[PDB]
């Protein structure tokens, strides 16, 4: 790999610089190189990995939705034929998105997840695995759509089971996992009632645990709780 000759510490430093420069593709490449050194990632390093690829895939998802909407309009009744171009370019972006998702899943599988034994690392990586299968699910249309969906569900569910046994209900990783699994339920699995139930139960059990927290942990938890509330407000 292109980063094989750079020190692990230098890759991490440059990932932090790229974040400051809003150079997320660079940030992602540096963190991939850091992961490929074979050592486990600290809490900070895991979050740099996640932030980098979330930003990269985020721009691709936003582009794909723009193009998918144009494509759908061009296939409506009374729409003037424009040729293969819209479909071709949507497919190009889609393929790049799928490549990024495959790259992240590849790092999780080789070998981040199998070496992660603490709840805070294992839940984090399994959440990410569910997230990147979910992004694949968003653009899936063929005969593997169901298996992609079930791969996301499976990863989320294992993370939920560990988080419920090993983490307090206000733990921000646990909270962010439940947020994302609830969105999975709502718009990927077509289970809006499960989504609403998960988000309500998650919010209420966090509320009842806030009294145990410091001022700074309180801020971290209530930030994600507000995201659960925002969704519940749209859903009910």
């Amino acid at each position: 790999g292109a980063m094989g000759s750079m020190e692990r510490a230098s890759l991490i430093q440059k990932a932090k610089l790229a974040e400051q420069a809003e150079r997320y593709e660079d940030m992602a490449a540096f963190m991939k190189g850091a992961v490929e050194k074979g050592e486990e990632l600290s809490c900070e390093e895991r979050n740099l990995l996640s932030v980098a690829y979330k930003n990269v895939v985020g721009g691709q998802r936003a582009a794909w939705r723009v193009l998918s909407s144009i494509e759908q309009k061009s296939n409506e009744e009374g729409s003037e034929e424009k040729g293969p171009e819209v479909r071709e370019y949507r497919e190009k972006v889609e393929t790049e998105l799928q490549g990024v998702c495959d790259t992240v899943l590849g790092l999780l599988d080789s070998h981040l997840i199998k070496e992660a034994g603490d709840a805070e690392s294992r839940v984090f990586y399994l959440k990410m695995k569910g997230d990147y299968y979910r992004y694949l699910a968003e653009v899936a249309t063929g005969d593997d759509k169901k298996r992609i969906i079930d791969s996301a569900r499976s990863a989320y569910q294992e993370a939920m089971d560990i988080s419920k046994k090993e983490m307090p209900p206000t733990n921000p990783i646990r909270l962010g996992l439940a947020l994302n699994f609830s969105v999975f339920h709502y718009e990927i699995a077509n289970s809006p009632e499960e989504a609403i139930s998960l988000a309500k139960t998650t919010f209420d059990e966090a509320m009842a645990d806030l009294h145990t927290l410091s001022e700074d942990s309180y801020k971290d938890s209530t930030l994600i709780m507000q995201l659960l509330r925002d969704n519940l407000t749209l859903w009910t």
């Binding site: 997320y24 996640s50 932030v51 985020g58 939705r65 997230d131 709502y186 995201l227």
Partner: peptide
């Protein structure tokens, strides 16, 4: 279309 809240950067 309408995107619901998920964790971390809303970069999309």
């Amino acid at each position: 279309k309408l995107m619901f809240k998920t964790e971390g950067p809303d970069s999309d």
